[PDB]
Amino acid sequence: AGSMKLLNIKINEFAVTANTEAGDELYLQLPHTPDSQHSINHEPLDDDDFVKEVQEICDEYFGKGDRTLARLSYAGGQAYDSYTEEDGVYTTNTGDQFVEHSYADYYNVEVYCKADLV
């Protein structure tokens, strides 16, 4: 788990896809919550330690230094460059708006909802 490399990473609006040195294909519904359905080579993936290790590598890739940017990128399905926050709504560099997900305080996970009309 700990010393193989991630060789390809891409993000869409439904999941983060990854390809490892070992040839496996991760399909990860990030951030990790009880609602997530992860797949390893089109098979169900139920190692929460592995999913959290890849999610931590992807927090460091997308959020750069700020994990909040990575969480906004997961919610938006695209790698954002920056964001500003005001009154609880987060606006990224492309103008996309987000608010905190309703499950955030209950899952104790940083998750966001794409608030288009807020």
mmCIF file of N, CA and C in Angstrom:
data_model
loop_
_atom_site.group_PDB
_atom_site.id
_atom_site.type_symbol
_atom_site.label_atom_id
_atom_site.label_comp_id
_atom_site.label_asym_id
_atom_site.label_seq_id
_atom_site.Cartn_x
_atom_site.Cartn_y
_atom_site.Cartn_z
ATOM 1 N N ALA A 1 0.833 -1.194 0.000
ATOM 2 C CA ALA A 1 0.000 0.000 0.000
ATOM 3 C C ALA A 1 0.868 1.243 0.000
ATOM 4 N N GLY A 2 1.915 1.206 0.822
ATOM 5 C CA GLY A 2 2.662 2.394 1.182
ATOM 6 C C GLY A 2 3.780 2.836 0.258
ATOM 7 N N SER A 3 4.303 1.940 -0.587
ATOM 8 C CA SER A 3 5.467 2.274 -1.401
ATOM 9 C C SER A 3 5.283 1.991 -2.887
ATOM 10 N N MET A 4 4.063 1.760 -3.353
ATOM 11 C CA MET A 4 3.855 1.810 -4.789
ATOM 12 C C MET A 4 3.452 3.227 -5.184
ATOM 13 N N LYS A 5 3.635 3.543 -6.457
ATOM 14 C CA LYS A 5 3.479 4.908 -6.928
ATOM 15 C C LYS A 5 2.146 5.073 -7.635
ATOM 16 N N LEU A 6 1.580 6.266 -7.518
ATOM 17 C CA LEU A 6 0.446 6.643 -8.345
ATOM 18 C C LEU A 6 1.025 7.283 -9.598
ATOM 19 N N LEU A 7 0.697 6.721 -10.754
ATOM 20 C CA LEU A 7 1.278 7.179 -12.004
ATOM 21 C C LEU A 7 0.320 8.012 -12.835
ATOM 22 N N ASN A 8 -0.978 7.957 -12.547
ATOM 23 C CA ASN A 8 -1.918 8.807 -13.261
ATOM 24 C C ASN A 8 -3.098 9.147 -12.366
ATOM 25 N N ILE A 9 -3.528 10.404 -12.426
ATOM 26 C CA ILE A 9 -4.626 10.899 -11.606
ATOM 27 C C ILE A 9 -5.500 11.807 -12.469
ATOM 28 N N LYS A 10 -6.813 11.578 -12.447
ATOM 29 C CA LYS A 10 -7.753 12.440 -13.157
ATOM 30 C C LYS A 10 -9.018 12.588 -12.325
ATOM 31 N N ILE A 11 -9.706 13.711 -12.497
ATOM 32 C CA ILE A 11 -10.878 14.028 -11.691
ATOM 33 C C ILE A 11 -12.060 14.358 -12.594
ATOM 34 N N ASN A 12 -13.222 13.786 -12.276
ATOM 35 C CA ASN A 12 -14.461 14.168 -12.945
ATOM 36 C C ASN A 12 -15.485 14.489 -11.866
ATOM 37 N N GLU A 13 -16.738 14.704 -12.251
ATOM 38 C CA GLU A 13 -17.752 15.113 -11.285
ATOM 39 C C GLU A 13 -18.290 13.961 -10.454
ATOM 40 N N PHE A 14 -17.895 12.720 -10.744
ATOM 41 C CA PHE A 14 -18.422 11.583 -10.010
ATOM 42 C C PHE A 14 -17.378 10.841 -9.195
ATOM 43 N N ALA A 15 -16.092 11.036 -9.478
ATOM 44 C CA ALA A 15 -15.045 10.301 -8.781
ATOM 45 C C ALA A 15 -13.683 10.796 -9.239
ATOM 46 N N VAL A 16 -12.676 10.482 -8.428
ATOM 47 C CA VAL A 16 -11.274 10.609 -8.797
ATOM 48 C C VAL A 16 -10.798 9.251 -9.289
ATOM 49 N N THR A 17 -10.244 9.219 -10.491
ATOM 50 C CA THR A 17 -9.669 8.006 -11.043
ATOM 51 C C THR A 17 -8.155 8.060 -10.901
ATOM 52 N N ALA A 18 -7.560 6.914 -10.598
ATOM 53 C CA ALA A 18 -6.120 6.827 -10.433
ATOM 54 C C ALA A 18 -5.618 5.533 -11.050
ATOM 55 N N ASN A 19 -4.397 5.579 -11.559
ATOM 56 C CA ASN A 19 -3.708 4.405 -12.068
ATOM 57 C C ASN A 19 -2.372 4.331 -11.356
ATOM 58 N N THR A 20 -2.071 3.169 -10.791
ATOM 59 C CA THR A 20 -0.873 2.992 -9.989
ATOM 60 C C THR A 20 0.229 2.338 -10.807
ATOM 61 N N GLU A 21 1.440 2.366 -10.238
ATOM 62 C CA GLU A 21 2.579 1.693 -10.856
ATOM 63 C C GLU A 21 2.258 0.223 -11.073
ATOM 64 N N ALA A 22 1.537 -0.373 -10.124
ATOM 65 C CA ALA A 22 1.209 -1.789 -10.133
ATOM 66 C C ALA A 22 0.174 -2.137 -11.198
ATOM 67 N N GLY A 23 -0.429 -1.140 -11.853
ATOM 68 C CA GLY A 23 -1.382 -1.369 -12.923
ATOM 69 C C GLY A 23 -2.831 -1.327 -12.503
ATOM 70 N N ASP A 24 -3.100 -1.205 -11.210
ATOM 71 C CA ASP A 24 -4.464 -1.158 -10.712
ATOM 72 C C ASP A 24 -5.119 0.177 -11.041
ATOM 73 N N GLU A 25 -6.442 0.150 -11.179
ATOM 74 C CA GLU A 25 -7.217 1.342 -11.499
ATOM 75 C C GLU A 25 -8.180 1.611 -10.350
ATOM 76 N N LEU A 26 -7.932 2.705 -9.635
ATOM 77 C CA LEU A 26 -8.765 3.164 -8.536
ATOM 78 C C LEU A 26 -9.864 4.065 -9.074
ATOM 79 N N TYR A 27 -11.090 3.835 -8.620
ATOM 80 C CA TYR A 27 -12.220 4.714 -8.903
ATOM 81 C C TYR A 27 -12.779 5.088 -7.537
ATOM 82 N N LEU A 28 -12.418 6.269 -7.043
ATOM 83 C CA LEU A 28 -12.648 6.640 -5.654
ATOM 84 C C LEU A 28 -13.602 7.823 -5.571
ATOM 85 N N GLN A 29 -14.724 7.627 -4.886
ATOM 86 C CA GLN A 29 -15.682 8.696 -4.614
ATOM 87 C C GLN A 29 -15.208 9.480 -3.396
ATOM 88 N N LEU A 30 -14.388 10.505 -3.642
ATOM 89 C CA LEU A 30 -13.755 11.389 -2.670
ATOM 90 C C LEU A 30 -14.628 12.617 -2.419
ATOM 91 N N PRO A 31 -14.692 13.128 -1.177
ATOM 92 C CA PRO A 31 -13.996 12.599 0.001
ATOM 93 C C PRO A 31 -14.641 11.320 0.513
ATOM 94 N N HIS A 32 -13.913 10.582 1.344
ATOM 95 C CA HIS A 32 -14.387 9.296 1.832
ATOM 96 C C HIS A 32 -15.447 9.514 2.906
ATOM 97 N N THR A 33 -16.656 9.072 2.616
ATOM 98 C CA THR A 33 -17.796 9.064 3.548
ATOM 99 C C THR A 33 -18.453 7.702 3.469
ATOM 100 N N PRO A 34 -19.364 7.400 4.406
ATOM 101 C CA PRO A 34 -20.146 6.155 4.291
ATOM 102 C C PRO A 34 -20.913 6.014 2.983
ATOM 103 N N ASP A 35 -21.201 7.117 2.285
ATOM 104 C CA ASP A 35 -21.902 7.085 1.005
ATOM 105 C C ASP A 35 -21.011 6.676 -0.165
ATOM 106 N N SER A 36 -19.701 6.562 0.044
ATOM 107 C CA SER A 36 -18.763 6.327 -1.047
ATOM 108 C C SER A 36 -18.768 4.873 -1.503
ATOM 109 N N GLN A 37 -18.595 4.680 -2.811
ATOM 110 C CA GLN A 37 -18.452 3.359 -3.423
ATOM 111 C C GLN A 37 -17.147 3.379 -4.215
ATOM 112 N N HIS A 38 -16.109 2.764 -3.665
ATOM 113 C CA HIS A 38 -14.807 2.705 -4.308
ATOM 114 C C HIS A 38 -14.653 1.399 -5.077
ATOM 115 N N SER A 39 -13.871 1.450 -6.152
ATOM 116 C CA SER A 39 -13.661 0.297 -7.013
ATOM 117 C C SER A 39 -12.176 0.116 -7.277
ATOM 118 N N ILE A 40 -11.720 -1.131 -7.203
ATOM 119 C CA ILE A 40 -10.362 -1.508 -7.571
ATOM 120 C C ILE A 40 -10.473 -2.439 -8.772
ATOM 121 N N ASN A 41 -9.978 -1.981 -9.921
ATOM 122 C CA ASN A 41 -10.040 -2.740 -11.170
ATOM 123 C C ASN A 41 -11.450 -3.273 -11.429
ATOM 124 N N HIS A 42 -12.434 -2.376 -11.358
ATOM 125 C CA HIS A 42 -13.848 -2.703 -11.560
ATOM 126 C C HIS A 42 -14.369 -3.741 -10.566
ATOM 127 N N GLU A 43 -13.664 -3.955 -9.449
ATOM 128 C CA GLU A 43 -14.148 -4.737 -8.320
ATOM 129 C C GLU A 43 -14.340 -3.829 -7.112
ATOM 130 N N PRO A 44 -15.292 -4.133 -6.230
ATOM 131 C CA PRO A 44 -15.493 -3.277 -5.053
ATOM 132 C C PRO A 44 -14.254 -3.239 -4.169
ATOM 133 N N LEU A 45 -13.979 -2.056 -3.628
ATOM 134 C CA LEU A 45 -12.806 -1.798 -2.807
ATOM 135 C C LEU A 45 -13.267 -1.458 -1.397
ATOM 136 N N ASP A 46 -12.831 -2.246 -0.410
ATOM 137 C CA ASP A 46 -13.271 -2.066 0.973
ATOM 138 C C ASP A 46 -12.089 -2.103 1.929
ATOM 139 N N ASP A 47 -10.995 -1.453 1.559
ATOM 140 C CA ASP A 47 -9.886 -1.171 2.468
ATOM 141 C C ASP A 47 -9.862 0.322 2.774
ATOM 142 N N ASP A 48 -10.434 0.708 3.915
ATOM 143 C CA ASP A 48 -10.538 2.129 4.223
ATOM 144 C C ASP A 48 -9.164 2.740 4.454
ATOM 145 N N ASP A 49 -8.185 1.925 4.854
ATOM 146 C CA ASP A 49 -6.830 2.441 5.002
ATOM 147 C C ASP A 49 -6.197 2.754 3.650
ATOM 148 N N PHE A 50 -6.387 1.885 2.658
ATOM 149 C CA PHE A 50 -5.901 2.211 1.326
ATOM 150 C C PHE A 50 -6.609 3.427 0.747
ATOM 151 N N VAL A 51 -7.939 3.480 0.881
ATOM 152 C CA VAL A 51 -8.674 4.607 0.314
ATOM 153 C C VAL A 51 -8.261 5.900 0.998
ATOM 154 N N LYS A 52 -7.928 5.847 2.284
ATOM 155 C CA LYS A 52 -7.495 7.061 2.949
ATOM 156 C C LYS A 52 -6.054 7.405 2.610
ATOM 157 N N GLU A 53 -5.235 6.417 2.235
ATOM 158 C CA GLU A 53 -3.877 6.743 1.806
ATOM 159 C C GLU A 53 -3.868 7.376 0.414
ATOM 160 N N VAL A 54 -4.698 6.864 -0.494
ATOM 161 C CA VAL A 54 -4.809 7.517 -1.793
ATOM 162 C C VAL A 54 -5.530 8.852 -1.672
ATOM 163 N N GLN A 55 -6.493 8.973 -0.750
ATOM 164 C CA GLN A 55 -7.194 10.238 -0.581
ATOM 165 C C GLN A 55 -6.285 11.285 0.028
ATOM 166 N N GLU A 56 -5.292 10.859 0.787
ATOM 167 C CA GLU A 56 -4.343 11.798 1.365
ATOM 168 C C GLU A 56 -3.294 12.233 0.348
ATOM 169 N N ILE A 57 -2.883 11.310 -0.542
ATOM 170 C CA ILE A 57 -2.054 11.738 -1.659
ATOM 171 C C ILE A 57 -2.814 12.718 -2.559
ATOM 172 N N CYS A 58 -4.123 12.493 -2.744
ATOM 173 C CA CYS A 58 -4.873 13.363 -3.644
ATOM 174 C C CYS A 58 -5.246 14.679 -2.994
ATOM 175 N N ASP A 59 -5.363 14.691 -1.668
ATOM 176 C CA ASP A 59 -5.497 15.958 -0.975
ATOM 177 C C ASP A 59 -4.247 16.796 -1.177
ATOM 178 N N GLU A 60 -3.078 16.144 -1.173
ATOM 179 C CA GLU A 60 -1.852 16.904 -1.366
ATOM 180 C C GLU A 60 -1.635 17.308 -2.817
ATOM 181 N N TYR A 61 -2.205 16.567 -3.769
ATOM 182 C CA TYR A 61 -2.088 16.967 -5.169
ATOM 183 C C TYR A 61 -3.053 18.086 -5.542
ATOM 184 N N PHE A 62 -4.337 17.924 -5.232
ATOM 185 C CA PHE A 62 -5.318 18.920 -5.645
ATOM 186 C C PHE A 62 -5.320 20.133 -4.726
ATOM 187 N N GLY A 63 -5.467 19.929 -3.421
ATOM 188 C CA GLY A 63 -5.476 21.105 -2.577
ATOM 189 C C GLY A 63 -4.173 21.865 -2.464
ATOM 190 N N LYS A 64 -3.127 21.466 -3.185
ATOM 191 C CA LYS A 64 -1.791 21.998 -2.944
ATOM 192 C C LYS A 64 -1.488 21.991 -1.451
ATOM 193 N N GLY A 65 -1.474 23.171 -0.835
ATOM 194 C CA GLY A 65 -1.229 23.240 0.593
ATOM 195 C C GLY A 65 -2.505 23.206 1.403
ATOM 196 N N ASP A 66 -3.614 23.659 0.817
ATOM 197 C CA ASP A 66 -4.899 23.790 1.501
ATOM 198 C C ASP A 66 -5.816 22.640 1.096
ATOM 199 N N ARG A 67 -6.077 21.726 2.033
ATOM 200 C CA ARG A 67 -6.955 20.594 1.751
ATOM 201 C C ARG A 67 -8.365 21.035 1.370
ATOM 202 N N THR A 68 -8.787 22.221 1.818
ATOM 203 C CA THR A 68 -10.098 22.737 1.442
ATOM 204 C C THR A 68 -10.207 22.897 -0.070
ATOM 205 N N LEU A 69 -9.112 23.297 -0.723
ATOM 206 C CA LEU A 69 -9.124 23.397 -2.178
ATOM 207 C C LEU A 69 -9.344 22.030 -2.815
ATOM 208 N N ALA A 70 -8.735 20.984 -2.248
ATOM 209 C CA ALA A 70 -8.946 19.639 -2.771
ATOM 210 C C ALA A 70 -10.393 19.207 -2.602
ATOM 211 N N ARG A 71 -10.992 19.532 -1.455
ATOM 212 C CA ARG A 71 -12.379 19.141 -1.223
ATOM 213 C C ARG A 71 -13.324 19.888 -2.157
ATOM 214 N N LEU A 72 -13.062 21.176 -2.388
ATOM 215 C CA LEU A 72 -13.837 21.913 -3.380
ATOM 216 C C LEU A 72 -13.636 21.339 -4.777
ATOM 217 N N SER A 73 -12.440 20.823 -5.075
ATOM 218 C CA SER A 73 -12.210 20.260 -6.402
ATOM 219 C C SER A 73 -12.957 18.949 -6.578
ATOM 220 N N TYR A 74 -13.004 18.129 -5.525
ATOM 221 C CA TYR A 74 -13.832 16.927 -5.556
ATOM 222 C C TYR A 74 -15.296 17.286 -5.771
ATOM 223 N N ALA A 75 -15.794 18.280 -5.028
ATOM 224 C CA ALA A 75 -17.195 18.662 -5.178
ATOM 225 C C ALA A 75 -17.482 19.232 -6.559
ATOM 226 N N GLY A 76 -16.503 19.893 -7.173
ATOM 227 C CA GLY A 76 -16.696 20.501 -8.471
ATOM 228 C C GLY A 76 -16.321 19.632 -9.641
ATOM 229 N N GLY A 77 -15.662 18.505 -9.386
ATOM 230 C CA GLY A 77 -15.288 17.618 -10.467
ATOM 231 C C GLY A 77 -14.150 18.110 -11.325
ATOM 232 N N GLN A 78 -13.374 19.077 -10.838
ATOM 233 C CA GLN A 78 -12.267 19.632 -11.602
ATOM 234 C C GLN A 78 -11.252 20.227 -10.642
ATOM 235 N N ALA A 79 -9.992 20.235 -11.070
ATOM 236 C CA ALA A 79 -8.899 20.749 -10.253
ATOM 237 C C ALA A 79 -8.901 22.273 -10.296
ATOM 238 N N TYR A 80 -9.322 22.902 -9.202
ATOM 239 C CA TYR A 80 -9.316 24.354 -9.103
ATOM 240 C C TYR A 80 -7.926 24.858 -8.724
ATOM 241 N N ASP A 81 -7.674 26.133 -9.032
ATOM 242 C CA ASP A 81 -6.388 26.752 -8.729
ATOM 243 C C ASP A 81 -6.394 27.491 -7.398
ATOM 244 N N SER A 82 -7.510 28.121 -7.052
ATOM 245 C CA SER A 82 -7.594 28.914 -5.836
ATOM 246 C C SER A 82 -9.060 29.108 -5.484
ATOM 247 N N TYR A 83 -9.291 29.652 -4.293
ATOM 248 C CA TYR A 83 -10.647 29.948 -3.861
ATOM 249 C C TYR A 83 -10.613 31.049 -2.813
ATOM 250 N N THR A 84 -11.759 31.697 -2.650
ATOM 251 C CA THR A 84 -12.009 32.642 -1.575
ATOM 252 C C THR A 84 -13.299 32.213 -0.894
ATOM 253 N N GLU A 85 -13.444 32.581 0.376
ATOM 254 C CA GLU A 85 -14.614 32.206 1.158
ATOM 255 C C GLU A 85 -15.245 33.444 1.765
ATOM 256 N N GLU A 86 -16.576 33.494 1.741
ATOM 257 C CA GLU A 86 -17.271 34.576 2.424
ATOM 258 C C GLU A 86 -18.627 34.086 2.903
ATOM 259 N N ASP A 87 -18.906 34.309 4.189
ATOM 260 C CA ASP A 87 -20.215 34.038 4.779
ATOM 261 C C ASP A 87 -20.629 32.577 4.611
ATOM 262 N N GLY A 88 -19.642 31.688 4.493
ATOM 263 C CA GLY A 88 -19.877 30.268 4.329
ATOM 264 C C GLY A 88 -19.979 29.738 2.914
ATOM 265 N N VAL A 89 -19.939 30.594 1.896
ATOM 266 C CA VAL A 89 -19.959 30.148 0.504
ATOM 267 C C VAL A 89 -18.566 30.359 -0.084
ATOM 268 N N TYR A 90 -18.058 29.331 -0.766
ATOM 269 C CA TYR A 90 -16.705 29.301 -1.313
ATOM 270 C C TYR A 90 -16.784 29.471 -2.824
ATOM 271 N N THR A 91 -16.101 30.486 -3.343
ATOM 272 C CA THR A 91 -16.044 30.751 -4.775
ATOM 273 C C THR A 91 -14.633 30.450 -5.258
ATOM 274 N N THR A 92 -14.521 29.563 -6.244
ATOM 275 C CA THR A 92 -13.230 29.179 -6.789
ATOM 276 C C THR A 92 -12.825 30.134 -7.914
ATOM 277 N N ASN A 93 -11.685 29.847 -8.545
ATOM 278 C CA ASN A 93 -11.165 30.755 -9.558
ATOM 279 C C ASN A 93 -12.009 30.771 -10.827
ATOM 280 N N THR A 94 -12.754 29.706 -11.111
ATOM 281 C CA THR A 94 -13.658 29.666 -12.254
ATOM 282 C C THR A 94 -15.045 30.220 -11.950
ATOM 283 N N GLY A 95 -15.268 30.746 -10.750
ATOM 284 C CA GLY A 95 -16.561 31.269 -10.369
ATOM 285 C C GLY A 95 -17.524 30.269 -9.760
ATOM 286 N N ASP A 96 -17.177 28.983 -9.735
ATOM 287 C CA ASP A 96 -18.050 27.982 -9.135
ATOM 288 C C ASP A 96 -18.197 28.237 -7.637
ATOM 289 N N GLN A 97 -19.430 28.164 -7.148
ATOM 290 C CA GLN A 97 -19.723 28.385 -5.739
ATOM 291 C C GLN A 97 -19.996 27.058 -5.036
ATOM 292 N N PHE A 98 -19.628 26.997 -3.758
ATOM 293 C CA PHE A 98 -19.848 25.813 -2.939
ATOM 294 C C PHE A 98 -20.230 26.243 -1.536
ATOM 295 N N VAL A 99 -20.949 25.364 -0.840
ATOM 296 C CA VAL A 99 -21.217 25.515 0.584
ATOM 297 C C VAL A 99 -20.832 24.211 1.269
ATOM 298 N N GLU A 100 -20.809 24.237 2.595
ATOM 299 C CA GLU A 100 -20.499 23.024 3.335
ATOM 300 C C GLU A 100 -21.624 22.009 3.186
ATOM 301 N N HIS A 101 -21.248 20.750 2.982
ATOM 302 C CA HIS A 101 -22.241 19.697 2.842
ATOM 303 C C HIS A 101 -22.969 19.499 4.164
ATOM 304 N N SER A 102 -24.221 19.050 4.079
ATOM 305 C CA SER A 102 -25.008 18.848 5.291
ATOM 306 C C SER A 102 -24.465 17.715 6.151
ATOM 307 N N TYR A 103 -23.740 16.771 5.556
ATOM 308 C CA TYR A 103 -23.190 15.630 6.272
ATOM 309 C C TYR A 103 -21.838 15.925 6.908
ATOM 310 N N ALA A 104 -21.319 17.148 6.758
ATOM 311 C CA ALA A 104 -19.940 17.429 7.148
ATOM 312 C C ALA A 104 -19.736 17.242 8.648
ATOM 313 N N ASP A 105 -20.612 17.838 9.461
ATOM 314 C CA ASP A 105 -20.459 17.758 10.908
ATOM 315 C C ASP A 105 -20.808 16.378 11.459
ATOM 316 N N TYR A 106 -21.607 15.589 10.735
ATOM 317 C CA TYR A 106 -22.028 14.274 11.208
ATOM 318 C C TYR A 106 -21.058 13.169 10.806
ATOM 319 N N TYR A 107 -20.520 13.232 9.588
ATOM 320 C CA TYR A 107 -19.466 12.313 9.180
ATOM 321 C C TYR A 107 -18.101 12.713 9.717
ATOM 322 N N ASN A 108 -17.973 13.923 10.264
ATOM 323 C CA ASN A 108 -16.675 14.521 10.568
ATOM 324 C C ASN A 108 -15.722 14.351 9.388
ATOM 325 N N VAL A 109 -16.208 14.752 8.214
ATOM 326 C CA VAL A 109 -15.440 14.796 6.978
ATOM 327 C C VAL A 109 -15.632 16.173 6.359
ATOM 328 N N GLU A 110 -14.571 16.718 5.767
ATOM 329 C CA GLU A 110 -14.684 17.974 5.025
ATOM 330 C C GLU A 110 -15.276 17.662 3.654
ATOM 331 N N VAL A 111 -16.572 17.932 3.487
ATOM 332 C CA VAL A 111 -17.271 17.705 2.229
ATOM 333 C C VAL A 111 -18.002 18.981 1.851
ATOM 334 N N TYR A 112 -18.226 19.161 0.550
ATOM 335 C CA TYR A 112 -18.836 20.377 0.033
ATOM 336 C C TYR A 112 -19.920 20.039 -0.981
ATOM 337 N N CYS A 113 -20.882 20.952 -1.106
ATOM 338 C CA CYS A 113 -21.994 20.854 -2.040
ATOM 339 C C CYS A 113 -21.902 22.022 -3.013
ATOM 340 N N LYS A 114 -22.104 21.749 -4.301
ATOM 341 C CA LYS A 114 -21.954 22.783 -5.328
ATOM 342 C C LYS A 114 -23.194 23.673 -5.322
ATOM 343 N N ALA A 115 -23.095 24.820 -4.653
ATOM 344 C CA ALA A 115 -24.191 25.785 -4.531
ATOM 345 C C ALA A 115 -24.186 26.765 -5.698
ATOM 346 N N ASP A 116 -24.871 26.408 -6.787
ATOM 347 C CA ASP A 116 -24.856 27.264 -7.974
ATOM 348 C C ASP A 116 -25.625 28.564 -7.757
ATOM 349 N N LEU A 117 -26.783 28.502 -7.097
ATOM 350 C CA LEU A 117 -27.696 29.638 -7.032
ATOM 351 C C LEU A 117 -27.695 30.331 -5.672
ATOM 352 N N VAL A 118 -26.667 30.109 -4.859
ATOM 353 C CA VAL A 118 -26.607 30.683 -3.518
ATOM 354 C C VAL A 118 -26.076 32.113 -3.526
#
